[PDB]
Write an enzyme that holds these catalytic residues in place. Structure first.
Site, PDB file in Angstrom:
ATOM      1  N   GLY A 200      16.040 128.026  18.110  1.00 41.05           N
ATOM      2  CA  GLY A 200      14.520 126.565  18.598  1.00 41.05           C
ATOM      3  C   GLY A 200      13.383 127.004  17.691  1.00 41.05           C
ATOM      4  O   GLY A 200      13.048 126.848  18.248  1.00 41.05           O
TER       5      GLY A 200
ATOM      6  N   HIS B 183      14.919 117.912   9.965  1.00 42.83           N
ATOM      7  CA  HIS B 183      15.685 118.292  10.470  1.00 42.83           C
ATOM      8  C   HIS B 183      15.840 117.855  11.572  1.00 42.83           C
ATOM      9  O   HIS B 183      17.229 117.909  12.417  1.00 42.83           O
ATOM     10  CB  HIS B 183      17.012 119.504   9.785  1.00 42.83           C
ATOM     11  CG  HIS B 183      16.464 120.641  10.694  1.00 42.83           C
ATOM     12  ND1 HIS B 183      15.643 122.199  10.199  1.00 42.83           N
ATOM     13  CD2 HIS B 183      16.991 120.958  12.491  1.00 42.83           C
ATOM     14  CE1 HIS B 183      15.729 122.981  10.683  1.00 42.83           C
ATOM     15  NE2 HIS B 183      16.068 122.464  11.415  1.00 42.83           N
TER      16      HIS B 183
ATOM     17  N   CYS C 158      12.227 127.054  14.794  1.00 40.11           N
ATOM     18  CA  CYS C 158      12.328 126.260  13.325  1.00 40.11           C
ATOM     19  C   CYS C 158      11.055 125.763  14.018  1.00 40.11           C
ATOM     20  O   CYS C 158      10.552 125.216  15.531  1.00 40.11           O
ATOM     21  CB  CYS C 158      13.445 125.294  13.621  1.00 40.11           C
ATOM     22  SG  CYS C 158      14.442 125.565  12.467  1.00 40.11           S
TER      23      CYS C 158
HETATM   24  C1  LIG Z   1      16.123 125.883  14.107  1.00 45.45           C
HETATM   25  O1  LIG Z   1      16.198 124.683  13.874  1.00 45.45           O
HETATM   26  C2  LIG Z   1      16.777 126.546  13.124  1.00 45.45           C
HETATM   27  C3  LIG Z   1      16.601 128.294  13.319  1.00 45.45           C
HETATM   28  C4  LIG Z   1      17.959 128.751  12.443  1.00 45.45           C
HETATM   29  C5  LIG Z   1      18.791 129.074  14.415  1.00 45.45           C
HETATM   30  C6  LIG Z   1      19.517 130.455  14.627  1.00 45.45           C
HETATM   31  N1  LIG Z   1      18.805 131.600  13.217  1.00 45.45           N
HETATM   32  C7  LIG Z   1      17.621 130.551  12.953  1.00 45.45           C
HETATM   33  O2  LIG Z   1      16.580 130.824  11.817  1.00 45.45           O
HETATM   34  N2  LIG Z   1      17.500 126.315  12.403  1.00 45.45           N
HETATM   35  C8  LIG Z   1      19.209 125.419  11.957  1.00 45.45           C
HETATM   36  O3  LIG Z   1      20.062 125.990  12.791  1.00 45.45           O
HETATM   37  C9  LIG Z   1      19.465 125.622  10.877  1.00 45.45           C
HETATM   38  C10 LIG Z   1      19.151 123.755  10.746  1.00 45.45           C
HETATM   39  C11 LIG Z   1      19.669 123.070   9.195  1.00 45.45           C
HETATM   40  C12 LIG Z   1      19.106 123.599   8.192  1.00 45.45           C
HETATM   41  C13 LIG Z   1      20.623 121.562   9.005  1.00 45.45           C
HETATM   42  N3  LIG Z   1      20.771 125.975  10.349  1.00 45.45           N
HETATM   43  C14 LIG Z   1      21.020 127.272  10.340  1.00 45.45           C
HETATM   44  O4  LIG Z   1      19.778 128.152  10.577  1.00 45.45           O
HETATM   45  O5  LIG Z   1      22.637 127.604  10.811  1.00 45.45           O
HETATM   46  C15 LIG Z   1      22.489 128.892  10.846  1.00 45.45           C
HETATM   47  C16 LIG Z   1      23.243 129.603  12.365  1.00 45.45           C
HETATM   48  C17 LIG Z   1      22.944 130.910  12.733  1.00 45.45           C
HETATM   49  C18 LIG Z   1      23.279 131.551  14.355  1.00 45.45           C
HETATM   50  C19 LIG Z   1      24.383 131.966  14.070  1.00 45.45           C
HETATM   51  C20 LIG Z   1      25.646 130.802  13.945  1.00 45.45           C
HETATM   52  C21 LIG Z   1      26.022 129.323  14.598  1.00 45.45           C
HETATM   53  C22 LIG Z   1      23.737 128.692  14.609  1.00 45.45           C
HETATM   54  C23 LIG Z   1      23.209 130.409  14.922  1.00 45.45           C
HETATM   55  C24 LIG Z   1      23.870 128.378  13.662  1.00 45.45           C
END
Ligand SMILES: *[C@@H](O)[C@H](C[C@@H]1CCNC1=O)NC(=O)[C@H](CC(C)C)NC(=O)OC[C@@H]1C[C@@H]2CCC[C@@H](C2)C1
Ligand SMILES: *[C@@H](O)[C@H](C[C@@H]1CCNC1=O)NC(=O)[C@H](CC(C)C)NC(=O)OC[C@H]1C[C@@H]2CCC[C@@H](C2)C1
EC number: 3.4.19.12
Lengths: 298, 296
Positions: free
Chosen positions: B139, B37, B141
């Site tokens: 960040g 992603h 991931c």
């Molecule tokens: C790494 O890119 C990231 C890690 C997440 C971010 C917050 N805690 C984590 O473990 N992954 C993502 O952002 C992921 C991308 C999709 C799979 C395309 N989505 C996601 O994790 O959504 C949930 C977060 C939770 C937190 C509160 C509200 C806004 C943000 C941050 C979405």
């Protein structure tokens, strides 16, 4: 959760030090190896050693220092309090930026538990007010170190020397000065009664507020002296000025004055939780420092 | 709660940027592994057609940084939810390693990283519902989970997302998710979680080894009668292999496995009555029997 610092910069400094058949771990920084002085003791000498007398009998060529199976030649030795400093003929190429610091009770640090110079695991420890830690140390772990990492720099704060009758652990800073009233002798020694780390409980309450869990915030405040006198009746530590200051960032982040949070804590001590929980727990946690709370929340 | 030393993994972490999306990669030999992603924009994440998004990318859209040094991408491919970036430089710090897919109830260490820099290390378990209770922020991931045996690093987890409940989900290093989850920016629920019974028993044995035994009793139980009660309380069933695995701890302590099962049954039916075990007010299920043994 307890989160340790990444251990690699410390793994790159671990060696083993052997005198006769006694092997423990040492810390190799630049061209010096630091280790507990009781490596020079026979099992029989540990019962009560005369360290100055044992050391005068020793020469550089009696110390076996190894990084893995590779011997490091010792070219000088001296004793500083309860640690031995062995000058070696090779500067450690993996030496990080580092400093030696002496921590206060309540502060947390990571321990890299080692055996025979080989790291086994890493975990987070808190220095208790009675100057013990609840380590996970077995025979052969002495010389394992505790540390914090700030930006590039490893702050070594603990070196492991002994276990107490109650299962907790005692050691020195990297200048060889014990934390607490302990001595490196194989005698029965007792720690003072332990107390709860107030500054860390307050940090935990601030963490709860940051996460939206704030039922315990009351409308009152208190003076620091009044709070300290009450807290001691519940076997909580009194706060220092330094504690008030290290709560500054969390107080600023939440807008809750330190002394107001103290008043909220006082009410919890006096009235209990009344069957409620904070951060999914009926127990107040005291092994997360204000820095730890900030570390994990960002 | 002891993690493996993280040095061998720290030497593999890099930063991977595509557009305004930055996360971590794992650099082994001349390949960097990272969540696919990274190639998404904010809009793409709602319903990404990854094969279509990827065919439109060029090697030069990927900025890989190892410290102050950029590694040039000379090729790329996708394996399930992981992107594999071929770079012109070999990582001299590559450890001996393998990729494994772990089973629910197994534990591993997580090296949490941000912008390619290691930040912390901690122990996690794969939940029965294939989530992990991690501590991951924006960040993180591309952070990985691993176990170390002798000199060999077994990578088992790469991090991709957080669910609405705050638990975490990700893939093995072949890019296949643990659990019924998808790498799209949509709210996803997990199946009902259960408690890892063999691990609770191992933790109770640890509590005994450390001189605490207030929860023991003189009752016993058959395996099947224990399992009926366990399932009623949303604990995982205990298999005969679990009992065998617990043999060493039973021998060490002189407490038959089914006797400890009787102790746990009592705790499940009566609660802890305010007492604590190894400091905890709750029954802990993220220590395996191997974990307990290695540390005692
Ligand atoms: C790494 O890119 C990231 C890690 C997440 C971010 C917050 N805690 C984590 O473990 N992954 C993502 O952002 C992921 C991308 C999709 C799979 C395309 N989505 C996601 O994790 O959504 C949930 C977060 C939770 C937190 C509160 C509200 C806004 C943000 C941050 C979405
Ligand atoms: C490293 O050399 C060990 C590490 C110890 C051993 C197992 N767990 C640990 O933390 N250090 C020691 O063995 C020291 C050496 C002396 C200080 C010179 N001694 C020690 O820890 O003894 C334990 C002690 C505890 C009770 C009080 C005194 C007699 C026994 C009961 C043994």
């Amino acid at each position: 959760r307890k989160m340790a610092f990444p251990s690699g910069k410390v793994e790159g400094c671990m060696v083993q030090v052997t005198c006769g058949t006694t092997t423990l771990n040492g810390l190799w920084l630049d061209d010096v190896v630091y280790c507990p002085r009781h490596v020079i003791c026979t099992s029989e000498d540990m019962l009560n050693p005369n360290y100055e007398d044992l050391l005068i009998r020793k020469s550089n060529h009696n110390f076996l220092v190894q990084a893995g199976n590779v011997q490091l030649r010792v070219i000088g030795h001296s004793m500083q309090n309860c640690v031995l400093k062995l000058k070696v003929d090779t500067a450690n190429p993996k030496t990080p930026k580092y400093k030696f610091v002496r921590i206060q009770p309540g502060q947390t640090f990571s321990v890299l538990a080692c055996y025979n110079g080989s790291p086994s695991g890493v975990y987070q420890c808190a220095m208790r007010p009675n100057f013990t830690i609840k380590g996970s140390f077995l025979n052969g772990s002495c010389g394992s170190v505790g540390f914090n990492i700030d930006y590039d720099c490893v702050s070594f704060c603990y070196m492991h020397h002994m276990e107490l009758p109650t299962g907790v652990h005692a050691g020195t800073d990297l200048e060889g000065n014990f934390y607490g009233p302990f001595v490196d002798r194989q005698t029965a020694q007792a720690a003072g009664t332990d107390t709860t780390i107030t500054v860390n409980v307050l940090a935990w309450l601030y963490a709860a507020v940051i996460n939206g869990d704030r039922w315990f915030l009351n409308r009152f405040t208190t003076t620091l002296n009044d709070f300290n006198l009450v807290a001691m009746k519940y076997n909580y530590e009194p706060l220092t000025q330094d504690h008030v200051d290290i709560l500054g960032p969390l107080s600023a982040q939440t807008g809750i004055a330190v002394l107001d949070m103290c008043a909220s804590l006082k009410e919890l001590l006096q009235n209990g939780m009344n069957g409620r929980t904070i951060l999914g727990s009926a127990l107040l946690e005291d092994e997360f420092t204000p820095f730890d709370v900030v570390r994990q929340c960002s």
